Write a protein that binds this ligand. Sequence first.
Ligand SMILES: Cc1cc2nc3c(=O)[nH]c(=O)nc-3n(C[C@H](O)[C@H](O)[C@H](O)COP(=O)(O)OP(=O)(O)OC[C@H]3O[C@@H](n4cnc5c(N)ncnc54)[C@H](O)[C@@H]3O)c2cc1C
Ligand SMILES: Cc1cc2nc3c(=O)[nH]c(=O)nc-3n(C[C@H](O)[C@H](O)[C@H](O)COP(=O)(O)OP(=O)(O)OC[C@H]3O[C@@H](n4cnc5c(N)ncnc54)[C@H](O)[C@@H]3O)c2cc1C
Ligand SMILES: CC(=O)OC/C=C(\C)CC/C=C(\C)CC[C@H]1OC1(C)C
Ligand SMILES: [Cl-]
Lengths: 472, 472
Amino acid sequence: TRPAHAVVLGASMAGTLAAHVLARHVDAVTVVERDALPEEPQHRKGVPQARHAHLLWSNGARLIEEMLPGTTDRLLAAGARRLGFPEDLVTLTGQGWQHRFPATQFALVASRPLLDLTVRQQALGADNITVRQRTEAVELTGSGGGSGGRVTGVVVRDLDSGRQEQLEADLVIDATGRGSRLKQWLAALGVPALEEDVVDAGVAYATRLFKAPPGATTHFPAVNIAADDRVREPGRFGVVYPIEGGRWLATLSCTRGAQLPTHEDEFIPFAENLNHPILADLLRDAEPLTPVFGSRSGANRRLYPERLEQWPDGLLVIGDSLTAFNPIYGHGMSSAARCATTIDREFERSVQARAGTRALQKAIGAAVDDPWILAATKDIDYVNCRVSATDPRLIGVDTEQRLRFAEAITAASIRSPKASEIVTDVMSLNAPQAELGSNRFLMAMRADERLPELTAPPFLPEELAVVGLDAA
Amino acid sequence: TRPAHAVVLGASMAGTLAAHVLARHVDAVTVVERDALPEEPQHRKGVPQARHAHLLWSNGARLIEEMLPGTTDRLLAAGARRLGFPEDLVTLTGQGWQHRFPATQFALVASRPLLDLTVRQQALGADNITVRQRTEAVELTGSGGGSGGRVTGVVVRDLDSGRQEQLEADLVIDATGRGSRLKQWLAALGVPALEEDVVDAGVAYATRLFKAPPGATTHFPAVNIAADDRVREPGRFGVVYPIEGGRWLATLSCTRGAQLPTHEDEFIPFAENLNHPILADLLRDAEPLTPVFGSRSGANRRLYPERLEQWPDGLLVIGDSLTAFNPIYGHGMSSAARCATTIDREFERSVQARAGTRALQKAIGAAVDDPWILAATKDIDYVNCRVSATDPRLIGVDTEQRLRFAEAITAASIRSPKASEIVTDVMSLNAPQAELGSNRFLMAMRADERLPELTAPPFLPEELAVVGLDAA
Ligand SMILES: Cc1cc2nc3c(=O)[nH]c(=O)nc-3n(C[C@H](O)[C@H](O)[C@H](O)COP(=O)(O)OP(=O)(O)OC[C@H]3O[C@@H](n4cnc5c(N)ncnc54)[C@H](O)[C@@H]3O)c2cc1C
Ligand SMILES: Cc1cc2nc3c(=O)[nH]c(=O)nc-3n(C[C@H](O)[C@H](O)[C@H](O)COP(=O)(O)OP(=O)(O)OC[C@H]3O[C@@H](n4cnc5c(N)ncnc54)[C@H](O)[C@@H]3O)c2cc1C
Ligand SMILES: CC(=O)OC/C=C(\C)CC/C=C(\C)CC[C@H]1OC1(C)C
Ligand SMILES: [Cl-]
């Protein structure tokens, strides 16, 4: 028989999308969220990464727009910018500057709390969605111990007065995030441990927001300094994106072995000593609007509940709980949208005992494969990267065959339009990484023209006039 | 390493589409076809079903259009018709006449040889495709059984010289259709037998081609008398479709226990003994252009190579060879297009592991589930139906509840616009059969208005004037 009540743990991107989707297929859905959610855009305790740069790649954006029509126009009215790639960015790769070919993909950029609010408003207004704020999931209950267990509900605790309630339900959705209490709950029911691939390059972040020169958030590009160097030196990177309200969101990052700015005054010097100091030039006369924010949530991890024979019935794991990625590639929100979309597309087909929630988690795991293999492939080669994985695409691979080809892909994408186009398809999560090994790509990479190398960041003169730096 | 040479066995719809797709991912593609392929739209021995009415549902038409842009316009310029459902059809169901709501789906209708030629012209002109006509696939080469069987190529025989030749290949695609000798080729290699579901209502067809009254193929709807009483009485059905050249293709059908016309003078009386005699009224004075053609290719059957642990590497099976349906629901060509589209989307991901073909075949198997479960569900309850299936959606099911739910779906779709729209999504193969059990459908089915029962076929006066009738 069908699930009549579903409870989703978490009201971040994964849980909000899953709640809306499950509300179409289940009579009642209740969402459990620890924080209070404001109806004006504010940062909150449960989303600590919201202080850092968040790009909603076109894959996630289109999937959210299809589930929740009007969300993008709504975002555009609230001041978000639709950055076209590679056209609206000044990007330095390890092979040189990206030619700003006419945009072949896009990403929506705005403050993460604004996007979360916009999605929550579109998604949680259904009458069969009850949102229980200030409520925490303690552990889950079920008929475990193996032989083919089932999850029956979740222990919740109200946070304004610590009274508890055993939340009983036909299906439980773990969207608690990267720090989620899933593997301890799995232990508490006696189901054996999951298989887990890890590629951890130890990426850490440091973000500050500035007030952009008037008109810069519309008439000036974003700037991204990314030194590809993996196997000789820890990476150090920095990016500045425009957001709503005429403000620049500046995020610095590095890999294990390099050290981040932690004081305000050492921030710009990190931007100063990148391979080009363009970020420091932009940030010297901007109004700082925030302190430094830090994050060390930089590992690629992936659990494979689809591989375990004793995966309990009635339980699903989505979002950062299922698999989390190096944020440098910006796929977590698109991977979350894929999980909900997969649920929407396969729900009725697989609930037709629940021998079908195996198929759901199998479908979900297949939906998150693209952002996993993308991030892990690029991170596996960093010095000081810590790896514990079974993926034959990573481990059964000549490391110098991957490096030489990684460099060649990059060199093509910065100066060949047709290779740039396919590479942005992969980077936007609209084509699998394997497409970069396809006959089609290898043909473009060889047949397409290659423009001369850019000897300076490809700013247009009028763009430097908006931020007042023409001598560059 | 990656496949460099692929051999496609059969050049009907499944093999032509698969060859076109494979030529984009593999250096060389050879197509082996027993028949000579005409450069004019002509019938041929290898596709005898082409004598009968063929509908290309929007699912297949859109997938073909995306693989081969311009195919639809080229079909329409050659005289194909775009039939909107339900608007452009006068249909009698077991619950009454379908209200001709504004079209929510469509199908392209033309003679199958015209559709085949147009597709082959768009698809087989790639320069890395070699088509070996008048050539027969005799057997496969390789080792089978054990921990790792593989197909290495194909023994072919030229039919004009009689000479044989071992065609080596990295990948072999069986697209030889319902009469495919794949199970003997697997036995000859030592592969254990496949699991196979069958739901066989003994469907048969009898078709004649007629000259339509002038203008009827553009200004007169198709007509479909499709009223059953499955569990008490064999089905008897009839359809008249317009095709190119001002012609009507009339296909009568019945299930096991009823008798089809075999002689020309028995054709109109079968149409007369349908629940409404409109088909006989339309055809009585129409000029017949052919004798009666018959077909007994009416079983639903599905092989599950994706379930076989000893499925050999380098082998894929698609099209009617993998799974074939009762043609009354008209999904075989859309299922073929789904197999080719799946190969296009999953190929690169699945070669970068053994030969990658187990993952492809599994993806192919999931893509053919929609037409299988639809056709099998509708046929399973016919009197004298032969059922040999392990599908739990079919076998573990209260049959009076299934008949009771089928009747209710039909009664809703004929008289409620919102129920019609969802049913046409399912019937056009654009939403799974399971959607008819969703909360969305059950609520649409109850909340929507229901128009009055039609007491006569919903022809317009102008349409009855085109064919010279005053009242059905
Ligand atoms: C530095 C950084 C930068 C990133 N940049 C990008 C980017 O540019 N683009 C992009 O697409 N993604 C980006 N990501 C990833 C993205 O932020 C996440 O993948 C996304 O938020 C999806 O996570 P989630 O919703 O599954 O979980 P989370 O966002 O981590 O949310 C978990 C939610 O569950 C709640 N919760 C947790 N435990 C409990 C409990 N026990 N009881 C009740 N409630 C609970 C929390 O309060 C919270 O609301 C970035 C991540 C980081 C760390
Ligand atoms: C009566 C009837 C009506 C139908 N109506 C519809 C409809 O309305 N809509 C729809 O979508 N589908 C319809 N179908 C189904 C549709 O005809 C098939 O699904 C479609 O042709 C795809 O089949 P295929 O390419 O896999 O195989 P086939 O069309 O059967 O082609 C097999 C090909 O392989 C070749 N071949 C066979 N053996 C060998 C060998 N040993 N070596 C080399 N070549 C070989 C044959 O010559 C042929 O070219 C109908 C089918 C029937 C029987
Ligand atoms: C309601 C019900 O009974 O199921 C749905 C099927 C119907 C109504 C048959 C319409 C005929 C169709 C599409 C023709 C298919 C093609 O094979 C021929 C040659 C006839
Ligand atoms: Cl036939």
